[PDB]
Amino acid sequence: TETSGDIKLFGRYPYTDLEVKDITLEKYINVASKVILPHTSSRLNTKKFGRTKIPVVERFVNAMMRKGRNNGKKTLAMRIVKDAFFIIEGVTGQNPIQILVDAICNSGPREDSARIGKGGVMKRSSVDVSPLRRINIAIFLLAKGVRNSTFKDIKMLPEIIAEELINAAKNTQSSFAVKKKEEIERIAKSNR
Amino acid sequence: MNKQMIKYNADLETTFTVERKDFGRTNRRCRACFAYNGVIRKYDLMICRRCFREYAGDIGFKIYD
Amino acid sequence: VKRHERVEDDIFNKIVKDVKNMRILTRTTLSERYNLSLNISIKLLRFLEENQIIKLISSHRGSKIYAGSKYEPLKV
Amino acid sequence: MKYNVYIEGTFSGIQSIMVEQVYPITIKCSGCNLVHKKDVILSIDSINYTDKDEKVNLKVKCASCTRQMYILIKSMATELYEEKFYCAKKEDNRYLASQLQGRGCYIEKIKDANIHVLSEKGRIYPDIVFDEGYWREEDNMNNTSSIEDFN
Amino acid sequence: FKEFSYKGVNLETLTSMSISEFKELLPSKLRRSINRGFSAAERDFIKKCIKARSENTGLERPEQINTNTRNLPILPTMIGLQIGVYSGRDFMPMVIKEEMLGRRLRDYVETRKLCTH
Amino acid sequence: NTEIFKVRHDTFIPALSEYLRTNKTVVPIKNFDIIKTSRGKETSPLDINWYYTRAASIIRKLLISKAKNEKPLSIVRFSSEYGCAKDRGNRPNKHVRASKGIIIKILNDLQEKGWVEKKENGWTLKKEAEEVSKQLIEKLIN
Amino acid sequence: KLVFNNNPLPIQAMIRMFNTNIDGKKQIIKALTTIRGIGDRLSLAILRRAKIPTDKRAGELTEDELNEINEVILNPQKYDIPEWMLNHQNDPIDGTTKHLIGNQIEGTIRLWNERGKKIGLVRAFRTSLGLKVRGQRTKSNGRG
RNA sequence: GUAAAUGUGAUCGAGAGGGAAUGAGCACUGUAAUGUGCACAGGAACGAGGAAUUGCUAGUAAUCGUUAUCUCAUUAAGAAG
Ligand SMILES: [Zn+2]
Numbered sequence A: 001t002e003t004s005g006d007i008k009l010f011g012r013y014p015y016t017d018l019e020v021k022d023i024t025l026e027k028y029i030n031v032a033s034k035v036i037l038p039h040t041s042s043r044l045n046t047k048k049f050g051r052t053k054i055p056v057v058e059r060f061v062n063a064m065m066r067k068g069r070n071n072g073k074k075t076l077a078m079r080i081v082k083d084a085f086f087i088i089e090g091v092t093g094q095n096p097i098q099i100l101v102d103a104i105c106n107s108g109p110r111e112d113s114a115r116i117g118k119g120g121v122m123k124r125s126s127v128d129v130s131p132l133r134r135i136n137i138a139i140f141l142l143a144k145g146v147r148n149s150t151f152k153d154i155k156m157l158p159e160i161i162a163e164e165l166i167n168a169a170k171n172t173q174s175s176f177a178v179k180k181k182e183e184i185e186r187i188a189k190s191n192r
Numbered sequence B: 001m002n003k004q005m006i007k008y009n010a011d012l013e014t015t016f017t018v019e020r021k022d023f024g025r026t027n028r029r030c031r032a033c034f035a036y037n038g039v040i041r042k043y044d045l046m047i048c049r050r051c052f053r054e055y056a057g058d059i060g061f062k063i064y065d
Numbered sequence C: 001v002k003r004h005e006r007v008e009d010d011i012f013n014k015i016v017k018d019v020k021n022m023r024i025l026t027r028t029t030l031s032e033r034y035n036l037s038l039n040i041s042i043k044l045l046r047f048l049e050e051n052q053i054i055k056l057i058s059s060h061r062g063s064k065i066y067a068g069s070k071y072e073p074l075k076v
Numbered sequence D: 001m002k003y004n005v006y007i008e009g010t011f012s013g014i015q016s017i018m019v020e021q022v023y024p025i026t027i028k029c030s031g032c033n034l035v036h037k038k039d040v041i042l043s044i045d046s047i048n049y050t051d052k053d054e055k056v057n058l059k060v061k062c063a064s065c066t067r068q069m070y071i072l073i074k075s076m077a078t079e080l081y082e083e084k085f086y087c088a089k090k091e092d093n094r095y096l097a098s099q100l101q102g103r104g105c106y107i108e109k110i111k112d113a114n115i116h117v118l119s120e121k122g123r124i125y126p127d128i129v130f131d132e133g134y135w136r137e138e139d140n141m142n143n144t145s146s147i148e149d150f151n
Numbered sequence E: 001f002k003e004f005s006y007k008g009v010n011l012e013t014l015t016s017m018s019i020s021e022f023k024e025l026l027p028s029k030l031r032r033s034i035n036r037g038f039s040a041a042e043r044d045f046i047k048k049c050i051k052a053r054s055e056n057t058g059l060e061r062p063e064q065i066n067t068n069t070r071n072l073p074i075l076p077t078m079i080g081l082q083i084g085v086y087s088g089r090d091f092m093p094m095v096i097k098e099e100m101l102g103r104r105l106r107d108y109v110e111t112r113k114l115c116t117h
Numbered sequence F: 001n002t003e004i005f006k007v008r009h010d011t012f013i014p015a016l017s018e019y020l021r022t023n024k025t026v027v028p029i030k031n032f033d034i035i036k037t038s039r040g041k042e043t044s045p046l047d048i049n050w051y052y053t054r055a056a057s058i059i060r061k062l063l064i065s066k067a068k069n070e071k072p073l074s075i076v077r078f079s080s081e082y083g084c085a086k087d088r089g090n091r092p093n094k095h096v097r098a099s100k101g102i103i104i105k106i107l108n109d110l111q112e113k114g115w116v117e118k119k120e121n122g123w124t125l126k127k128e129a130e131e132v133s134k135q136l137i138e139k140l141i142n
Numbered sequence G: 001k002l003v004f005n006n007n008p009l010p011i012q013a014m015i016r017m018f019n020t021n022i023d024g025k026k027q028i029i030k031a032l033t034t035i036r037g038i039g040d041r042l043s044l045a046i047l048r049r050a051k052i053p054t055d056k057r058a059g060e061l062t063e064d065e066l067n068e069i070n071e072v073i074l075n076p077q078k079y080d081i082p083e084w085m086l087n088h089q090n091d092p093i094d095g096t097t098k099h100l101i102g103n104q105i106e107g108t109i110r111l112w113n114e115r116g117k118k119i120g121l122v123r124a125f126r127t128s129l130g131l132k133v134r135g136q137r138t139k140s141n142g143r144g
Numbered sequence H: 001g002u003a004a005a006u007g008u009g010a011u012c013g014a015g016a017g018g019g020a021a022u023g024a025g026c027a028c029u030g031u032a033a034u035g036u037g038c039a040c041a042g043g044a045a046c047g048a049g050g051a052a053u054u055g056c057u058a059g060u061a062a063u064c065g066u067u068a069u070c071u072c073a074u075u076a077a078g079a080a081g
Helices: A056-062 A074-092 A096-107 A131-149 A157-169 A176-190 B049-059 C009-019 C027-032 C038-050 E028-035 E040-055 F009-021 F050-067 F075-081 F100-112 F127-140 G028-034 G040-050 G063-074 G104-118 G122-129
Strands: A111-115 A124-128 B004-008 B015-019 C024-026 C055-060 C063-067 D002-008 D010-012 D014-019 D022-029 D040-043 D058-061 D068-075 D085-087 D089-091 D094-103 D105-110 D115-119 D135-138 D144-148 E065-067 E082-086 E091-095 F084-086 F094-096 F116-119 F122-125 G014-016 G021-023
Touching: A056 A074, A056 A096, A074 A096, A074 A157, A074 C024, A074 C055, A074 C063, A096 A131, A096 A157, A096 A176, A111 A176, A124 A176, A131 A157, A131 A176, A157 A176, B004 E040, C024 C027, C027 C038, C038 C063, D002 D014, D010 D014, D014 D085, D014 D094, D014 D144, D022 D068, D022 D094, D040 D058, D040 D068, D068 D105, D094 D105, D115 D135, D115 D144, E040 E065, F009 F050, F009 F127, F050 F075, F050 F100, F050 F122, F050 F127, F075 F100, F100 F116, G021 G028, G028 G040, G040 G063, G104 G122
Parallel strands: E065 E082
Antiparallel strands: A111 A124, B004 B015, C024 C063, C055 C063, D002 D094, D010 D144, D014 D115, D022 D040, D022 D105, D058 D068, D068 D094, D089 D094, D135 D144, E082 E091, F084 F094, F116 F122, G014 G021
């Protein structure tokens, strides 16, 4: 219908010339795999690092099927994010994809708190997070910020997605996800 | 048995007959043990769940899966 | 205070001056900046998109999105 | 730790203040210094035991450090009105309702207490509600009962 | 003051109607019971009521009529009579007043004593 | 050819509805303005001309049935086609049929105009009802 | 200068129909659900016989429109609303069918229950004590 | 009584969510309504749950209907698929 060219996301977005821009993250973020629609059934979850090979916007829609009542409603999630990309592409002026990439980069906490004490009482200490866990937490926080913001507010959900992601990419205090990344890093330092 | 009952119309003078329908436990007693409870009625068996399990292998039922 | 069921003349006048230089605008903005109800943010927004003052950029199911005089899209 | 629960304010036309010994409380673990994620209802009628068979009104495990926390209510009531209501002990310009005894925790806040008033005319006002720290009632004989600056 | 009335009809007319006519007044579930015809027991009860209202004269009361016909709707032929309805234990006595029309005899007798702990 | 499939349903059902009303080929049931389409529905229709959208969609069911050479359509078939999920308080929702009375009236109206013929096991189209549809589509796609 | 020409009329805050108050800002459908005896379903029935657009707000209606609706409430059977749409069908005391509005409902239920109690109808005795009468079990649920 | 979630367009707008106790009716099953369906009302608590506590590693958990499966005249808010 719309095009007879090369594969673009939602048939709209360029799908090339994409940079991660944190060498600690490089291997764990799939922006290679050209797909027309953020849907795949590829059975990688039954593997040792197979959940790191799933494409980026896929991981991002999965995060929306939550709050219990929305389990399994993956079409609804795609409908929501499609609209958000229109809002963001407009607002930012750059491939929605680079906004999403930079949101992840900023929103993962680098140091964390954990119990270390084995042969006695369990005493809390700071510890250093792996690349993979760092990105897992980034998606979690971005999602949790969005969900709770929309609950009993008149604004449309696709609009709230655009509010948070811009701010997160720009590392502003305005993001719920960014603030909570500061909190975790401050407490980690308190227990250092 | 299909039993019959007389009934009178509103005049209390004319009479008509109606048939009692056979339903409920009263005629579905277990064919092995006369029990009224837990009778399997499927495939025109009329045998209780206790009696079924001892005879099932004689009838020809098996647990494949 | 509760929301309103009219767009009076002086609110109407200043909305025209405000809708230029705004980028993407939506049902909520008219109803959360000014005091209008959702049932009168629809009617005013639909009117401005007939007058060529704004332009519609999406209308998928009931989700409906508009643009003003300082919008500019991506380029290849 | 011991905490006295006072009822403070300016009292007019009041014979006695009676208090339900049921306190929604915020508790902090004295081991890891973490606040319990929810308020807990501390009631005098709740019967629990320490690991040494001592009666307590609350037994809670800290979710973070697994330490046991215990609270006992000691009613400071001088009498029971109608065998139901704990009459708070009058002390100068305030009323001592109870003493809370915490072990393994601190009590950070008491949120609310259900309060009943006995007027100088022998009228009971059950479950009084404060508006901005004020309560006032008038009887059919124009006697006023009031509490101002409630704390 | 006006005469007693049921669904538009005066007690004078109502006491003269056939059961077939009275059926056009009653609620739906009671109508269905009269359409499906009376039992042999119910017929004896009704014939005794018709006999009794006819036989009784002067100021002396007629004797009580007992029945286990619990589901029978009350009819204008047993007005003023004393009737005993079986409670599963005993014949509980009652007088059939005008205001009872449109209800079954089971509606005026309790098979289970009220509970007070 | 199977000419009906060349145009989109949400353009065809509204298109025929006007041709019906301007010739009054079907006449509303008594109290159409307050009756519901099923016991499963919550409120009566939002469009006063719902009766005509039913008439327009009934002829569509018949055109596609004719196109695929199915067996003739029955009053039961149509009732299950228009069915829905009824709300039952504190219980799961349950599938329920459309009401037959509307459908019966439409089919008897169409019979009198010679648009629908009754067979022994269902209802079927007639030449005039096919040609109206044909001549509409030939403008509508262009 | 251009003009909007699609604005509602100058609106009143609240109005009186039935010894009941109706919020003028509210759209006519959910607004007539303030009067006792006008549920959702019957509210739509009246408005389409009085012939008022459903989308106007209650404070925009003229005196004329309020008389049109007032007339249809006092006598629905005149404007072809059938009896199976109405509150009180085959009245035991009158034979007729009628539609009870406002405080008439409670008054009629009371005089009815009171009559049953005067003659010992078991159904009326239970409702007076707060008990149930539609066969529901009373052991597990419905306490206090 | 031959899916429902679901797909498109309208509509409604923050107790137009919710359907508990109850009225005069209109039908069905039945030997008998006390059981079930329907229409018009009526419109209770509940605004996400204390101490505790139960399963679940992939077409799994949770959601959505459906049973020419079992009970069954009429009755599923139960099991077994
Ligand atoms: Zn047996």
